[PDB]
Enzyme design. Structure first.
Site, PDB file in Angstrom:
ATOM      1  N   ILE B  96       0.857  -1.177   0.000  1.00 53.39           N
ATOM      2  CA  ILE B  96       0.000   0.000   0.000  1.00 53.39           C
ATOM      3  C   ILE B  96       0.889   1.221   0.000  1.00 53.39           C
ATOM      4  CG2 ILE B  96      -2.235  -0.792   0.968  1.00 53.39           C
ATOM      5  CD1 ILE B  96      -1.132   0.736   3.746  1.00 53.39           C
ATOM      6  N   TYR B 158      -7.819   5.641   1.468  1.00 54.44           N
ATOM      7  CA  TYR B 158      -7.467   4.278   1.803  1.00 54.44           C
ATOM      8  C   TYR B 158      -8.695   3.392   1.691  1.00 54.44           C
ATOM      9  CZ  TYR B 158      -5.839   0.397   4.821  1.00 54.44           C
ATOM     10  OH  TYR B 158      -5.485  -0.798   5.378  1.00 54.44           O
ATOM     11  N   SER B 161      -9.842   2.755  -1.946  1.00 50.79           N
ATOM     12  CA  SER B 161      -9.001   1.748  -2.630  1.00 50.79           C
ATOM     13  C   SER B 161      -9.242   0.318  -2.157  1.00 50.79           C
ATOM     14  CB  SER B 161      -7.523   2.108  -2.546  1.00 50.79           C
ATOM     15  OG  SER B 161      -7.037   2.094  -1.212  1.00 50.79           O
ATOM     16  N   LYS B 162      -9.511   0.115  -0.855  1.00 52.62           N
ATOM     17  CA  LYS B 162      -9.776  -1.224  -0.305  1.00 52.62           C
ATOM     18  C   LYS B 162     -11.178  -1.704  -0.678  1.00 52.62           C
ATOM     19  CE  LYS B 162      -5.963  -2.065   1.954  1.00 52.62           C
ATOM     20  NZ  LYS B 162      -4.890  -2.858   1.332  1.00 52.62           N
TER      21      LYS B 162
HETATM   22  N1  LIG Z   1      -1.350  -2.823   9.886  1.00 53.85           N
HETATM   23  C1  LIG Z   1      -2.653  -2.708  10.083  1.00 53.85           C
HETATM   24  O1  LIG Z   1      -3.126  -2.239  11.128  1.00 53.85           O
HETATM   25  C2  LIG Z   1      -3.572  -3.080   8.956  1.00 53.85           C
HETATM   26  C3  LIG Z   1      -3.057  -3.456   7.730  1.00 53.85           C
HETATM   27  N2  LIG Z   1      -3.914  -3.773   6.669  1.00 53.85           N
HETATM   28  C4  LIG Z   1      -3.323  -4.102   5.324  1.00 53.85           C
HETATM   29  O2  LIG Z   1      -2.225  -4.964   5.476  1.00 53.85           O
HETATM   30  C5  LIG Z   1      -1.248  -4.727   4.439  1.00 53.85           C
HETATM   31  C6  LIG Z   1       0.118  -4.552   5.061  1.00 53.85           C
HETATM   32  O3  LIG Z   1       0.115  -3.463   6.016  1.00 53.85           O
HETATM   33  P1  LIG Z   1       1.338  -3.235   7.018  1.00 53.85           P
HETATM   34  O4  LIG Z   1       2.271  -4.389   7.002  1.00 53.85           O
HETATM   35  O5  LIG Z   1       0.760  -2.764   8.299  1.00 53.85           O
HETATM   36  O6  LIG Z   1       2.119  -1.994   6.361  1.00 53.85           O
HETATM   37  P2  LIG Z   1       3.666  -1.578   6.232  1.00 53.85           P
HETATM   38  O7  LIG Z   1       3.769  -0.102   6.062  1.00 53.85           O
HETATM   39  O8  LIG Z   1       4.457  -2.053   7.467  1.00 53.85           O
HETATM   40  O9  LIG Z   1       4.254  -2.283   4.950  1.00 53.85           O
HETATM   41  C7  LIG Z   1       3.797  -1.922   3.633  1.00 53.85           C
HETATM   42  C8  LIG Z   1       4.708  -2.566   2.621  1.00 53.85           C
HETATM   43  O10 LIG Z   1       4.450  -1.996   1.314  1.00 53.85           O
HETATM   44  C9  LIG Z   1       5.659  -1.567   0.720  1.00 53.85           C
HETATM   45  N3  LIG Z   1       5.394  -0.367  -0.075  1.00 53.85           N
HETATM   46  C10 LIG Z   1       5.022   0.860   0.411  1.00 53.85           C
HETATM   47  N4  LIG Z   1       4.888   1.782  -0.510  1.00 53.85           N
HETATM   48  C11 LIG Z   1       5.194   1.117  -1.688  1.00 53.85           C
HETATM   49  C12 LIG Z   1       5.242   1.544  -3.034  1.00 53.85           C
HETATM   50  N5  LIG Z   1       5.026   2.816  -3.416  1.00 53.85           N
HETATM   51  N6  LIG Z   1       5.551   0.619  -3.975  1.00 53.85           N
HETATM   52  C13 LIG Z   1       5.823  -0.632  -3.584  1.00 53.85           C
HETATM   53  N7  LIG Z   1       5.835  -1.142  -2.346  1.00 53.85           N
HETATM   54  C14 LIG Z   1       5.502  -0.211  -1.437  1.00 53.85           C
HETATM   55  C15 LIG Z   1       6.612  -1.323   1.886  1.00 53.85           C
HETATM   56  O11 LIG Z   1       7.997  -1.411   1.498  1.00 53.85           O
HETATM   57  P3  LIG Z   1       8.821  -0.132   1.092  1.00 53.85           P
HETATM   58  O12 LIG Z   1       8.538   1.106   1.868  1.00 53.85           O
HETATM   59  O13 LIG Z   1      10.175  -0.721   1.280  1.00 53.85           O
HETATM   60  O14 LIG Z   1       8.547  -0.076  -0.394  1.00 53.85           O
HETATM   61  C16 LIG Z   1       6.204  -2.403   2.879  1.00 53.85           C
HETATM   62  O15 LIG Z   1       6.941  -3.608   2.706  1.00 53.85           O
HETATM   63  C17 LIG Z   1      -1.796  -3.556   3.624  1.00 53.85           C
HETATM   64  O16 LIG Z   1      -2.460  -4.028   2.448  1.00 53.85           O
HETATM   65  C18 LIG Z   1      -2.728  -2.871   4.625  1.00 53.85           C
HETATM   66  O17 LIG Z   1      -3.804  -2.178   4.002  1.00 53.85           O
HETATM   67  C19 LIG Z   1      -5.248  -3.753   6.840  1.00 53.85           C
HETATM   68  C20 LIG Z   1      -5.789  -3.392   8.064  1.00 53.85           C
HETATM   69  C21 LIG Z   1      -4.954  -3.051   9.117  1.00 53.85           C
HETATM   70  C1  LIG Z   2      -7.026   2.154  11.971  1.00 53.63           C
HETATM   71  C2  LIG Z   2      -8.216   1.761  11.133  1.00 53.63           C
HETATM   72  C3  LIG Z   2      -9.472   2.241  11.823  1.00 53.63           C
HETATM   73  C4  LIG Z   2      -8.123   2.457   9.796  1.00 53.63           C
HETATM   74  C5  LIG Z   2      -8.244   0.234  10.940  1.00 53.63           C
HETATM   75  C6  LIG Z   2      -7.611  -0.581   9.977  1.00 53.63           C
HETATM   76  C7  LIG Z   2      -6.724  -0.155   8.932  1.00 53.63           C
HETATM   77  O1  LIG Z   2      -7.030  -0.146   7.751  1.00 53.63           O
HETATM   78  N1  LIG Z   2      -5.505   0.183   9.461  1.00 53.63           N
HETATM   79  C8  LIG Z   2      -4.403   0.617   8.646  1.00 53.63           C
HETATM   80  C9  LIG Z   2      -3.101   0.677   9.457  1.00 53.63           C
HETATM   81  C10 LIG Z   2      -1.947   0.956   8.521  1.00 53.63           C
HETATM   82  C11 LIG Z   2      -2.177   2.276   7.819  1.00 53.63           C
HETATM   83  C12 LIG Z   2      -2.253   3.385   8.847  1.00 53.63           C
HETATM   84  C13 LIG Z   2      -3.417   3.130   9.781  1.00 53.63           C
HETATM   85  C14 LIG Z   2      -3.210   1.806  10.492  1.00 53.63           C
HETATM   86  C15 LIG Z   2      -4.705   3.086   8.982  1.00 53.63           C
HETATM   87  C16 LIG Z   2      -4.639   1.971   7.954  1.00 53.63           C
HETATM   88  C17 LIG Z   2      -3.471   2.229   7.024  1.00 53.63           C
HETATM   89  C18 LIG Z   2      -7.983  -1.890  10.282  1.00 53.63           C
HETATM   90  N2  LIG Z   2      -8.787  -1.988  11.318  1.00 53.63           N
HETATM   91  N3  LIG Z   2      -8.964  -0.681  11.725  1.00 53.63           N
HETATM   92  C19 LIG Z   2      -9.789  -0.520  12.880  1.00 53.63           C
HETATM   93  C20 LIG Z   2      -9.183  -0.210  14.083  1.00 53.63           C
HETATM   94  C21 LIG Z   2      -9.934  -0.085  15.223  1.00 53.63           C
HETATM   95  C22 LIG Z   2     -11.292  -0.290  15.179  1.00 53.63           C
HETATM   96  C23 LIG Z   2     -12.079  -0.165  16.416  1.00 53.63           C
HETATM   97  O2  LIG Z   2     -11.410  -0.070  17.482  1.00 53.63           O
HETATM   98  O3  LIG Z   2     -13.335  -0.175  16.297  1.00 53.63           O
HETATM   99  C24 LIG Z   2     -11.907  -0.626  13.981  1.00 53.63           C
HETATM  100  C25 LIG Z   2     -11.150  -0.753  12.828  1.00 53.63           C
END
Ligand SMILES: NC(=O)C1=CN([C@@H]2O[C@H](COP(=O)(O)OP(=O)(O)OC[C@H]3O[C@@H](n4cnc5c(N)ncnc54)[C@H](OP(=O)(O)O)[C@@H]3O)[C@@H](O)[C@H]2O)C=CC1
Ligand SMILES: CC(C)(C)c1c(C(=O)N[C@H]2[C@@H]3C[C@H]4C[C@@H](C3)C[C@@H]2C4)cnn1-c1ccc(C(=O)O)cc1
Ligand SMILES: NC(=O)C1=CN([C@@H]2O[C@H](COP(=O)(O)OP(=O)(O)OC[C@H]3O[C@@H](n4cnc5c(N)ncnc54)[C@H](OP(=O)(O)O)[C@@H]3O)[C@@H](O)[C@H]2O)C=CC1
Ligand SMILES: CC(C)(C)c1c(C(=O)N[C@H]2[C@@H]3C[C@H]4C[C@@H](C3)C[C@@H]2C4)cnn1-c1ccc(C(=O)O)cc1
Ligand SMILES: [Cl-]
Ligand SMILES: [Cl-]
EC number: 1.1.1.146
Lengths: 265, 263
Positions: B96, B158, B161-162
């Protein structure tokens, strides 16, 4: 609950109003005595719609022709429309890029063009309209589909763009509540509607049954005027009952309660 | 139901694997003995990841660094990864664009960048991977959010897109059924997860994050078992309430009512 007098003298924009549902909404607003600024790419068809709007009794009917592919047109159109009517009370986002029922194979160009026209242009329009709507305690009316709530084959790019409208506008609605922005957002979840575009797309699928575009267009106006968050309109009574998701409403209401976001405003 | 042996010798791509959930999934696949090709923009972090994967026991671990802003990179990456593994069994679309919690005002640039990176790049990677997954009766694994099923303030671009990933992939899954394409699609609906990115974004008093390690495993389990949807939140309230049976009934009625064989 609703009254036609509610739209009398109001300043309304209708996109994709040269034909179909948009044209029917423009005519409805005209019968109610609204000031209307209509758009689509075709100047001639728009001129025919504006001519009929004045006969119907619109306070003032105008058109501005252009493509919602052009984000600079989209931005500028709002300013020009706003000047013509001397304000904005309602913004009816309805246009879509041309789509047909087909299997997805390799069409990134269609997926992106769907995203730009059906979704991004709506955001550009909203951004440009928001100051006028804020000062008039206005309404955004977003025209979506059953295909923007539920998954159907043959409209993947279309479904993706209508799902995005839900994500964006429903989220911005949560924000407007926290940031105390008194501008309402109505998402219209429509079933098949008997427009020439849809009816040509569906020709031969005899079991598929369209709903009246006339009533549909009225139901969209009624919804936005009454500041309803969601409007549902399908020919099936099965669909209307089953389309609502109370589980989502629960999860949304719980988060609204659990968190305070005042240190962002 | 699931067995770790199910991933042994499989050819898996993981996007956004230099950090967070993607990294954890790569490591999980490595413990299971899969062939892995990882991607993100940072070559050095990826090299440290590919080196840990081999220690953990991956059959073969490789990296290709680039930005998913570049659609040509996205298209080419799949071909290169496919050549390195001599095939493709699973596609894990996870990356993302950087996002923070903030009110939407005027950021079209962020809305579009979010759609290009978080959504279009996924379609580009899918199109490019499809012949390879078709010949291996493969799996697409799409990493979404609660914010991609339900509306939350401060993540508008965000959420948009999701929500699009759901619309696109759920629609193409219907199509794969009609066109008799034996390639599975798993949409992962995750709650808050304890990744540095998420924890930095939330530094949101009461928010409970879930373990990234278990989360990443749950994503693998789901795709391996060819499940349409995977749900992972810390709340038992959320997991029960997140499911939409109303939309499954509507989908099953349309599946029954219409025949699309002439497409
Ligand atoms: N963490 C959470 O609370 C939640 C996460 N998700 C979903 O889980 C997935 C992973 O999230 P999470 O691990 O927390 O996020 P991170 O930020 O820790 O990791 C995101 C990854 O994407 C890569 N990335 C970022 N920008 C780019 C770009 N422009 N081109 C290519 N690669 C890119 C990063 O590597 P680099 O910067 O090296 O390119 C990194 O490995 C996502 O799809 C997110 O929407 C969903 C709900 C909640
Ligand atoms: C943070 C939020 C709301 C958006 C969320 C996500 C999510 O998409 N988190 C991503 C994470 C990585 C990036 C930065 C932040 C944190 C926003 C998002 C992109 C997944 N569950 N959830 C969520 C959290 C709490 C509750 C609740 O307490 O009721 C309900 C839903
Ligand atoms: N009818 C149905 O079965 C369903 C309709 N809906 C929704 O209802 C809305 C209206 O649909 P409907 O009335 O059937 O559509 P129509 O095809 O009849 O009207 C589409 C309008 O949009 C304009 N338009 C098309 N392309 C562009 C473009 N690139 N830039 C600007 N304007 C453009 C057209 O004029 P021009 O081509 O001259 O520019 C026309 O005025 C859409 O949002 C659709 O998704 C939802 C579910 C079902
Ligand atoms: C046609 C379909 C599925 C996509 C649909 C829509 C929709 O969004 N149609 C679009 C319109 C604009 C473009 C040209 C046409 C019409 C096809 C699509 C692109 C709205 N309801 N609905 C639908 C139809 C039938 C049934 C059923 O019988 O169970 C359920 C839902
Ligand atoms: Cl029509
Ligand atoms: Cl992390």
């Amino acid at each position: 609950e609703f009254r036609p007098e509610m739209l009398q003298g109001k300043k309304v924009i209708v996109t994709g109003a040269s034909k179909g549902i948009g044209r029917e909404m423009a005519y409805h607003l005209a019968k109610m005595g609204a000031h209307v600024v209509v758009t689509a790419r075709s100047k001639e068809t728009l001129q025919k719609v504006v001519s009929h709007c004045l006969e119907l009794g619109a306070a003032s009917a105008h058109y501005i022709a252009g493509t919602m592919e052009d984000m600079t047109f989209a931005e500028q159109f709002v300013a020009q429309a706003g000047k013509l009517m001397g304000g904005l009370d309602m913004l009816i986002l309805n246009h879509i890029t041309n789509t047909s029922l087909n299997l997805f194979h390799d069409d990134i160009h269609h997926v992106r063009k769907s995203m730009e026209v059906n979704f991004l242009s709506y955001v550009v329009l909203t951004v440009a309209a928001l100051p006028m709507l804020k000062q008039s305690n206005g309404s955004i009316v977003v025209v979506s589909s059953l295909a923007g709530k539920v998954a159907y084959p043959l409209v993947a790019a279309y479904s993706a763009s209508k799902f995005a409208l839900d994500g964006f506008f429903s989220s911005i609605r949560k924000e407007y509540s926290v940031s105390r922005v008194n501008v309402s957002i109505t998402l219209c979840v429509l079933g098949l509607i008997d427009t020439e575009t849809a009816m040509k797309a569906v020709s031969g699928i005899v079991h598929m049954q369209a709903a009246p575009k006339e009533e549909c267009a009225l139901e969209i106006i009624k919804g936005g005027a009454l500041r309803q968050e969601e409007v549902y309109y399908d020919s099936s009574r099965w669909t209307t009952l089953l389309i609502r998701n109370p589980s989502r409403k629960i999860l949304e209401e719980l988060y609204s309660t659990s968190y305070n976001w005042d240190r962002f405003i």
